[PDB]
Amino acid sequence: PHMVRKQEIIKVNQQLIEAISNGDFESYTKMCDPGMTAFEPEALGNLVEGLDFHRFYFENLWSRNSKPVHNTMLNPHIHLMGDESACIAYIRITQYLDAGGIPRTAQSEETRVWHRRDGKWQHVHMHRSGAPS
Amino acid sequence: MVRKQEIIKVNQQLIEAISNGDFESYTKMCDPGMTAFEPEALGNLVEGLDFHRFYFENLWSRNSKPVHNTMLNPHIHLMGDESACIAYIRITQYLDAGGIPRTAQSEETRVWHRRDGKWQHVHMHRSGAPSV
Amino acid sequence: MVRKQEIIKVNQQLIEAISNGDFESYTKMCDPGMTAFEPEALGNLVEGLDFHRFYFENLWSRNSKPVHNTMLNPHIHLMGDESACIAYIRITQYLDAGGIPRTAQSEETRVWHRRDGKWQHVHMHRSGAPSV
Amino acid sequence: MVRKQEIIKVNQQLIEAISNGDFESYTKMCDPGMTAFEPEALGNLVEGLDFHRFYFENLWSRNSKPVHNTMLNPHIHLMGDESACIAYIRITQYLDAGGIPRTAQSEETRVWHRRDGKWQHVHMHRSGAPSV
Amino acid sequence: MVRKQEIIKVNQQLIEAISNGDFESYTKMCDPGMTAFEPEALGNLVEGLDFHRFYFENLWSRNSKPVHNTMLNPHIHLMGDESACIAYIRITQYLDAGGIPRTAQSEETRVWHRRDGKWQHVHMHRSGAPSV
Amino acid sequence: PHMVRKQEIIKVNQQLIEAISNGDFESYTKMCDPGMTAFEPEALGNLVEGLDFHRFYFENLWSRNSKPVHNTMLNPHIHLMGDESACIAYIRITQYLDAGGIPRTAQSEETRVWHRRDGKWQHVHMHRSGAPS
Amino acid sequence: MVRKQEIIKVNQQLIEAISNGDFESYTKMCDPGMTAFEPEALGNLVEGLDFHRFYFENLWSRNSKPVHNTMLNPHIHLMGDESACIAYIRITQYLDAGGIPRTAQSEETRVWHRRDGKWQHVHMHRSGAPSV
Amino acid sequence: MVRKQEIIKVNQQLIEAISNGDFESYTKMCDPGMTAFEPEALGNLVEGLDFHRFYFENLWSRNSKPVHNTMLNPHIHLMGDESACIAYIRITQYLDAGGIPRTAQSEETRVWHRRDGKWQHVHMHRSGAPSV
Amino acid sequence: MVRKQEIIKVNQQLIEAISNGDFESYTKMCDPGMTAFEPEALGNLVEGLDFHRFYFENLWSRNSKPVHNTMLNPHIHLMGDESACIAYIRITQYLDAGGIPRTAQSEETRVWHRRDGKWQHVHMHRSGAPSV
Amino acid sequence: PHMVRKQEIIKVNQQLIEAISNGDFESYTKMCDPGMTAFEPEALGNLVEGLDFHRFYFENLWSRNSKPVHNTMLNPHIHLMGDESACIAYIRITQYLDAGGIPRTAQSEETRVWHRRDGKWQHVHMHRSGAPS
Amino acid sequence: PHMVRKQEIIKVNQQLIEAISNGDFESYTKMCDPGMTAFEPEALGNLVEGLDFHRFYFENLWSRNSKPVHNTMLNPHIHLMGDESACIAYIRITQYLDAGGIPRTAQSEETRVWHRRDGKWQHVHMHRSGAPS
Amino acid sequence: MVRKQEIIKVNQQLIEAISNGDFESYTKMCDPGMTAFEPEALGNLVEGLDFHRFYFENLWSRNSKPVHNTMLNPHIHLMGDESACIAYIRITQYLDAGGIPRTAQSEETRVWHRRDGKWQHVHMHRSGAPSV
Amino acid sequence: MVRKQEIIKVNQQLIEAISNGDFESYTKMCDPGMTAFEPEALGNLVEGLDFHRFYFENLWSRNSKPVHNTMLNPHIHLMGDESACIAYIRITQYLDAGGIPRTAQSEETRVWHRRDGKWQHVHMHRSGAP
Amino acid sequence: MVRKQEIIKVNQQLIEAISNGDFESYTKMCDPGMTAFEPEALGNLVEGLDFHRFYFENLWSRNSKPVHNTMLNPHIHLMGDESACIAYIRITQYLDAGGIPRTAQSEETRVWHRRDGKWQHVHMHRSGAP
Ligand SMILES: O=C(O)Cc1cn2nc(-c3ccc(Cl)cc3)ccc2n1
Ligand SMILES: O=C(O)Cc1cn2nc(-c3ccc(Cl)cc3)ccc2n1
Ligand SMILES: O=C(O)Cc1cn2nc(-c3ccc(Cl)cc3)ccc2n1
Numbered sequence A, F, J, K: 001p002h003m004v005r006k007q008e009i010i011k012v013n014q015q016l017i018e019a020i021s022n023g024d025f026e027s028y029t030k031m032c033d034p035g036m037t038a039f040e041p042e043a044l045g046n047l048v049e050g051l052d053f054h055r056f057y058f059e060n061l062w063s064r065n066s067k068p069v070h071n072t073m074l075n076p077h078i079h080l081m082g083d084e085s086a087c088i089a090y091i092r093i094t095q096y097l098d099a100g101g102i103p104r105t106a107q108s109e110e111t112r113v114w115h116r117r118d119g120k121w122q123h124v125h126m127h128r129s130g131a132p133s
Numbered sequence B, C, D, E, G, H, I, L: 001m002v003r004k005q006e007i008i009k010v011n012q013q014l015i016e017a018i019s020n021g022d023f024e025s026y027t028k029m030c031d032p033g034m035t036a037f038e039p040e041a042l043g044n045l046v047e048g049l050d051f052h053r054f055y056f057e058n059l060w061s062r063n064s065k066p067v068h069n070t071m072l073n074p075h076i077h078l079m080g081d082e083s084a085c086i087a088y089i090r091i092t093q094y095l096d097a098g099g100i101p102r103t104a105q106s107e108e109t110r111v112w113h114r115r116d117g118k119w120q121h122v123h124m125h126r127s128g129a130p131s132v
Numbered sequence M, N: 001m002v003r004k005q006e007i008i009k010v011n012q013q014l015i016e017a018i019s020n021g022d023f024e025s026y027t028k029m030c031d032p033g034m035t036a037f038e039p040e041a042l043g044n045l046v047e048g049l050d051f052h053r054f055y056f057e058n059l060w061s062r063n064s065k066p067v068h069n070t071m072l073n074p075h076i077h078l079m080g081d082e083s084a085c086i087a088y089i090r091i092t093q094y095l096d097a098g099g100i101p102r103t104a105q106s107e108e109t110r111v112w113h114r115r116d117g118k119w120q121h122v123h124m125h126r127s128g129a130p
């Protein structure tokens, strides 16, 4: 019952990335535990509370973005720890266009930890290295 | 949480095993299929036990130099009673080629899974300083 | 300890006044003879609220710019009942000329003294990035 | 303000203990739970005696080097009768490997607590040039 | 080999499909699970049909600029009657933002598999110029 | 019968990499078709005949190397085209020590095409991008 | 050596055809299977008329620019009565976007074949400054 | 065509003489008045074997160094029966001062003329990397 | 001593005269034969009142931008009843062309002589920031 | 006697420079007020106590140096303030030999303030800008 | 009459520079032998035919320019070779205004060889080094 | 004309005299009042024989290293019976400190006058490579 | 001596003429065959007033921006009663393109010769920046 | 004039003394109160022979390496019969640390005064490189 339960983790994580790409902070907040933590390049090597720090990027950038972007989770690896917690790690490739309209690509590595709280998977901790995008 | 104190101590034993170069103690604490993101892996996800064998066999074993690792303000997410996630800034004091004390910072995420009363290391993510 | 929860509260009230440009609340919480080490002072110790008043009086009209400040892991040393000391990493999110968000880090030490049942800011030391 | 002259002297003994490398006198004068912001800690707050014990034990290639430390215009805030806060510019004169005289500047804040009958160092903040 | 002439012509139809931006003609010629190494993929192996859809939809379709692709001295390895491997230097003439003709070189390996009389593109490897 | 026949390709390709690492040009020549072709950084963007061009590196470098090196083929992908030809693609991570003895890592991407000639798999074409190592 | 003066003239008509952008006269004077080494081809040998047709058709923003080409000390090797090889330094005087006069140097080898009653250009090699 | 296989043979014999330092075989295959464009000539056309003799006479004692030269995709233009023209990419593998192998690329055009039933080298043009 | 504060105040009046651009009040406070070392004088000793007039008449008089000057830890040497020497770090807060608050440091020695009944500025030496 | 006093300041200042050039710290201390202050490039923009800070330079550089040096005071200007106070300002040109033994030149600007205490002139404050001695 | 001849070369050379400064190519051609040669910075180290190569500069730069220019011949040295030949060498200082209208100075070194053909002096070869006109 | 070859040869004898360092033969061929423009003269016109003596006596005389000089496409202007002007590109092949063959280009104008019965060098102008 | 202050006087009149751009007053004080070493001449000795008139006619005369010149500690060598040589550091305060005051230093040697009853400037040497 | 060639003669003797490092001959030809502008003085006017004696005593006297100095097109201003001013480009050929010949250019103004029956060097101005 793992191959399908892994597909459950892949689904909820891909929906989270879709919310980030579109700038939908409301769905982002629902899917994230209020006390989620984050390591990311924008945090300058510090561990921050995930939902307060990221609201600045949603409210001033990602809600305003209208440019075409394509995100690819390359060969995701999923660790199941029982039935109420999961860890997913993957290379995130982002395709976009610059100001000049010429195509560019950025890579980052993302770890995201999920916890089933009241039958809903909640994002509890993330670690991103690589490109800030 | 008294449970949080438990995760901190087992993570320090993993780090102390790394500092001493004890690859046997390291392997016991790790799930055989553990995965790793780290600067030495150049942005790839590696199998932690195959990739790290090069560093035990060629770097940390002789311990010809004093090394000190510090966990700064570790944050622990408990997912039930069988799973934990610990994140912290890792400060490493070491001696360079000249024998001068230096400091390096990295950020580490480590995920643990309790199987039959024993915590097993399942995934790690380190960013920051390339060398370790 | 709420005795320590008292120091963080008065310290965060000071930080909020800085972001909004509230010089009146700043002056109430600061002893008139407070001293400061900070990057803007070019390695010198500056006394009283005179050095800081310049930034309040000349950067308050740009409050159109959205900024968000984050305190991180405050550590408090208590020396008796009329004295304390708080240290923390200060994270500031802001927008540059191009409208793109950036982040800045600084380290802040702030010393407090109980005068008339009223905490007064007596000395500060900031290193890192200048206040954006 | 004779108690300020007491702080000036006890602080100079701490600096000379650092200059000479006398770690056991360093430990005498420092509270075991002191915290530190310093350039070597890369913008993090460290636990004082664990982090600093590494520099004392490994900086043996410098004892045969003359250094002179100066505290410039120290400013002392007295908080009651059992706590004191001293801030000063630290100028260090030394010789390099090439034998040529050099000067380095740093800014230091140090907080002291009168414990029992002796003053104890509880927190430090140094910005500027690294002590190593 | 008259067989070698067959591989060259089908590879040019794939390239001509890319030059025109015809994503439907491209997909017909490609195995659904084709893999790709290319500069835009930043050193990763991607699924060619998901990753390339961004380039068809945003770059090569409008054909507002004349483009010319050349296969220079293609070398074909025939592995029986069902498999072929073709390698060649790919020269692309294009117009820059200023409308000036420019030239870019890349090296391409493309592997083909004949299923039911139809050649299907199974794997490609491009190195050299990042943009295409 | 593919999961095991893929393991056949993985074996012969890993033996080829072992021959390159040790500098054994004789086993390298046996496993390579005499007319193999190569795209590699050292060839400066040209397609070269594989066995003549690489003998310079075996005879002057890789036969003389005694330093510890570790090669990892990360998540290899194998395309089977019938029963007499295969294509394998993988990220190649190389761990080594420099002159100073401090650890380093290099990444390259490798495509290698194999052809079963007289029941023996023969290396017919390679394409490497990334680091020259 | 009057046939050398014939080569000098037919070669100058080829250059002026390039200078004026007259591609159809270019095609008249060139053998359909000519090969070329030139800076724009990035060190590759290209098939002559397919590669060059792109520069004629897209360099329309320059016809309203005066240029003067000079062949310096041309050396002509006659190989029988139906083939000739001419080598020369090519100096090009032109005006930039800013209107300031410039000079560019290249070295050109061009091989000619008397086909029927007219000389045909079969191979060229240019090193130095790119024609565009 | 063996008529073309004749040109490549005499051309590769010339290239072998250069690597070994065989000036005698070089002189036999070259017309005494041959001309050359090459990087070592700094953009000038140099006549006869005088310019090249300097490299043979002064770089023959270092033949201890191992070098391997590779020709790539020669293209031959025939103009009648007494004239030909061959172009190819020349790849040179060598060792630098540190003993590490390097590779260099150049592009070479060589023109041949049949004098007395004997192919004579009449003109060459090399661009790219200077002969190592 | 009150003589020190008298020197401190007359020196502050001079600096305020400079900040506002009041050359008439500046001249009143300066001996007609005052001398000056300063960055603007390029290492030469100038007559202070002739050299500084150019700065009052073309820069400082028209300045309507807010400026704040700080005199850090002034040290005063009293020589008798009619002579004083004051030395201090001079911190100047200002707004740049972009309206951003900036800080500049200079070190100033100023020598004063009470002739008759009024303190007169006789010599200055400034190192550090080029002011203007 | 205003010209007598200036010739006296000129002489006492020349004696101070002589003691510095030879490295005679004992004569240096005699001529300096115990509380003299100094602005100098070596002090990194801070005002130091002249006799404590300079002891390091006498004890480790100037006293042991026997290399040829020539110092040139250029256009000294003297302000007399009453009868017990003087200040002298001048450009100091220093000729010296570097490690290679080649002559070099350095310029500094020096202000020195003197105070007649008892029957002796005492150096009370100095300001040097330019090249670090 | 060796001094007469040098005054004659000095004058005929001054007429050549006048024609160049004004952009009068018709007077330029009259004074120059049809086969004159030139070494100049604009020729990129090659020997050109002076009258064909320079026509581009008269027709597109010098003839239309009316900016203030002042040319200064410095210490001209004249070698007389017989009665029909002369060579003059001199430093040429050129004062001009740039795009911003600020005066600038350029130096070049000029050798010019003259040949008395018929009753007229003809300019047969020039060599200029230094600043590209 | 044979007068051209006469000038060509006397000029080649001068250059060979320079290469070998024979100042006595150099002086024989030069008019005592010869003038020179050259890179070594830093844009000044010098007396050729006094200025060049320093190079013969300290560099060129002691040279035992192989050098080859090439006179490319010399152009000779004949002025009557006793005057000539020769212009040419001068290519110098030499070995550097490392023993590596190198090439330098300069452009030379040399003016010759047949006084009595011997050609005399009266003026030279060299641009390009600083020789030495 | 009275002669030395006379030299300082005529030299400041020359400098004032340069600052104001008065070429007519410049020509009166300078010998027609005066020579000059100066940065603008690129290391050459230039003879006469033509080289300097280019700067008067295209910059210095039309300049309305305020300039202040300072002659620092002039040294005067008197060679009899008909010739003198004055050397001094010249500090020039000016406004740049942005209108901000700037300072430049040069070193000037100027040689004067009393022909008839008028001092005439015969040679100058300036080092520093154009 | 005979006077101008006399000035060229004594000036070359001064230059030869500098090249050879003969400070004694240098002192004889120079007025004890001579002044100098030169790159080594960092833009200052230096008075007397002490500044130059540092270079004689530590370099120029002990120099055995061959040096050749060239005075290019000297211009001489005669100011009566007791004073002269000579200006010229000075080209110096020398050997560097590696022993390779090199060339440096400077511009020199030198003022001479005939006191009694001896020409004395009273002021010099050199621009270029130290
Ligand atoms: O942290 C401190 O206690 C010193 C301090 C306060 N500030 N406040 C500002 C600031 C205040 C108000 C506005 Cl609107 C904009 C900027 C800048 C620097 C600074 N240093
Ligand atoms: O805290 C300070 O006041 C700064 C500081 C810098 N340093 N630098 C040294 C030092 C550095 C390199 C060598 Cl080779 C020898 C000595 C010693 C003390 C010190 N303190
Ligand atoms: O083959 C040659 O002789 C070199 C060469 C360089 N160029 N450069 C130009 C050119 C470049 C930029 C602009 Cl904006 C205008 C004109 C034209 C011809 C040419 N030939």
Ligand SMILES: O=C(O)Cc1cn2nc(-c3ccc(Cl)cc3)ccc2n1
Pocket (backbone or CB within 6 Å): H018, H019, H020, H021, H036, H038, H052, H055, H056, H059, H060, H061, H063, H124, H131, H132
């Ligand atoms: O390719 C050509 O026809 C011209 C040419 C020949 N050479 N030969 C050498 C060379 C010959 C012999 C030895 Cl041992 C070492 C080096 C170098 C440059 C070059 N250009």
